[PDB]
Amino acid sequence: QTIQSIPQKGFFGHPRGLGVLFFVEFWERFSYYGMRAMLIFYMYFAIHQNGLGIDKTTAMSIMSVYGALIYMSSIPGAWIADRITGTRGATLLGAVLIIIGHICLSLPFALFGLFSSMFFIIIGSGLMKPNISNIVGRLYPENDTRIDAGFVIFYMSVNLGALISPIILQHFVDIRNFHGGFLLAAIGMALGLVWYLLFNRKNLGSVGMKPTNPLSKEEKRKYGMIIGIIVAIVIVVLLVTYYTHTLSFDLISNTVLVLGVALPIIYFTTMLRSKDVTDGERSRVKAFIPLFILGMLFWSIQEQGSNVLNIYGLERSDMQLNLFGWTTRFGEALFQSINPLFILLFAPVISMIWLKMGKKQPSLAIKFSIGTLLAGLSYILIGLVGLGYGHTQFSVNWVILSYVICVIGELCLSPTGNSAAVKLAPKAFNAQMMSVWLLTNASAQAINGTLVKLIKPLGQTNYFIFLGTVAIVITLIILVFSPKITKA
Ligand SMILES: CC(C)[C@H](N)C(=O)OCCOCn1cnc2c(=O)[nH]c(N)nc21
């Protein structure tokens, strides 16, 4: 049995093994969102300043390409746990890969060590991020109503890592010792691994040690042919372009652009088709299409506060926090800590707003429209500030006020799109619907990987006013069809 092997208690009233993976996902997401927050500055900083010296636009662009691939790679890694390794194996493999990628940035490998890092982390992330989340659900038996808060606590380490690590890592940016910071994250990740190795056998029991739908003899051949070849075609066209000096990041940034727009369509096409989706569950899939837009428009802006907003604040504002007499230097890595901090504070409190309303709750597109409008309004804010002040160095107060408006928008849109991801998924294409909602984050990130090239031609300020406006315009449009979508 799956639930007879594992302790049903031991961690704030939940199964002991939720204590094991909290400590694992904490030390992973800590070193991820830490690395993720130096990395931008390790790229477009000058060589004398220990950086690498990459074009400001290639560096902003890597950031969104790197991001999107973290989330696309959850799709084959959900698969490899499903057909070859099982959830446990994939997570262990994923973790060991990640630590390799962090160690790479610690070594002085300049442009090679950067991408080998991206390679090793992206790989392990898809084997770990989605399959660690699988194992936590499988710890609760079929009719166990604890599973709900058990995921709230799990994702609480997610925000705890992502809160604490920009804080700590801020010093290695000031003393411009990038290598040393990537080593801290690197260790921090190993802590998680050691802890899993030491205590995974006894708290997780036998869960996910075997794959669910393993591959038959002929499937091992078919798939190992197909997958084998694409790996070859890819390798070659990289090899070919490196040694003919054709290769830049426009190859990668355009590929992913393509995937990020291709992959949502396939999923809705293979979904809306098939006679396995009744007339009830269909049309509802046509009703998530609009929501998928509003989730794409939203995460566009949100995930840009990791490569666009924070550069703008470092270069265009006084970087001096200034609240009711409390002034201090606002460290630039500290921008990536607002977004989790307000989640950790106000995830429980936007939970009461919807519970005290019961049925007069906002609809579902209503949330999705609220949270896209705000993110939209948030880019209109910072654009207008820059437009008012012009050349004069304004307060970093304003740059923070954008981040906040955005994270308040997410409070309506993050808890709803994943409540609704695998809520009304077709009672056959459930995972296929998990993969949809997640792509709201991956497509935004592949669109951003190319969207940022409009900064030079439109100017840093006007950029901000164009994006905020497509968000609000296109949101209001969909809001007129907001009763038809609600019929579901
Ligand atoms: C900048 C970051 C701190 C960012 N706001 C953040 O908290 O990212 C969380 C990492 O993404 C995974 N994740 C977090 N919450 C959820 C969630 O609620 N559902 C799913 N499927 N994935 C989630």
Author numbering: 9 to 496
Task: Please share text taken word for word from the publication where this structure appeared.
Recently we discovered a prokaryotic homolog of PepT1 from the bacterium Staphylococcus hominis, PepTSh, which was able to transport a natural thioalcohol-conjugated peptide, exhibiting structural characteristics similar to prodrug molecules. PepT1 and PepT2 belong to the much larger POT or PTR family of proton-coupled oligopeptide transporters, with homologs found in all domains of life except the archaea. POT family transporters belong to the major facilitator superfamily (MFS) of secondary active transporters, and use the proton electrochemical gradient to drive the concentrative uptake of di- and tripeptides into the cell. To address this question and understand how peptide-based prodrugs and nonproteinogenic drug molecules are recognized and transported via the SLC15 family, we determined the crystal structure of a bacterial POT family member in complex with both valacyclovir and 5-aminolevulinic acid at 3.1-Å and 2.5-Å resolution, respectively.
Following extensive screening, a crystal structure of PepTSh in complex with valacyclovir was subsequently determined using the in meso crystallization method and refined to a final resolution of 3.1 Å. PepTSh adopts an almost identical inward open conformation to that obtained in our previous study, with a root mean square deviation (rmsd) of 0.499 Å for 480 Cα atoms. The valacyclovir drug molecule was clearly observed sitting in the central peptide binding site, coordinating a single water molecule. The valine end of valacyclovir orientates toward the extracellular gate (TMs 1, 2 and 7, 8), which is closed, and the nucleoside part of the drug orientates toward the intracellular gate (TMs 4, 5 and 10, 11), which is open. Valacyclovir makes a number of specific interactions to side chains that are strictly conserved between PepTSh and both PepT1 and PepT2. The amino terminus interacts with a conserved glutamate, E418 (E595, human PepT1 numbering) on TM10 and through a hydrogen bond to an asparagine on TM8, N347 (N329). The carbonyl group makes a hydrogen bond to a conserved asparagine, N167 (N171) on TM5, and the ester bond, which links the l-valine to the acyclovir, interacts with tyrosine Y41 (Y40) on TM1. The acyclovir ether group interacts with another conserved tyrosine, Y79 (Y64) on TM2 and the nucleoside portion of the drug makes a distinctive pi-pi stacking interaction with tyrosine Y163 (Y167), also on TM5. The only nonconserved interaction is made between the nucleoside hydroxyl and N426 on TM10, which in PepT1 is a leucine (L630). Removal of Y163 abrogated valacyclovir recognition, underscoring its importance.
